């Protein structure tokens, strides 16, 4: 689009059908934990 080839390193990671969605929780759910 701009200047170069875009791939994203295809075929590299094996993931589940639901794939590791979010999962990282970003840790913003710590608002209920103390």
Partner 1 sequence: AMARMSPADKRKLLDELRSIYRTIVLEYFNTDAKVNERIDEFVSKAFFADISVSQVLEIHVELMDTFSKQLKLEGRSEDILLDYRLTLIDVIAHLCEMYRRSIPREV
Residues lying near partner 1 in the complex (CB under 8 A) = 1-2, 6-32
d(CA 34, CA 31): 8
Q: How far is the CB of 17 from partner 1 (least distance, A)?
A: 4
In degrees and rounded to multiples of 5, residue 13 shows phi and psi of -115, 135
Q: How far is the CB of 8 from partner 1 (least distance, A)?
A: 5
Q: How far is the CB of 26 from partner 1 (least distance, A)?
A: 5
């Amino acid at each position: 689009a701009m200047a170069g080839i875009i791939s994203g390193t295809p075929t590299r990671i094996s993931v589940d059908e639901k794939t590791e969605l979010a999962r990282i929780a970003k840790g913003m759910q710590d608002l209920e934990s103390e």
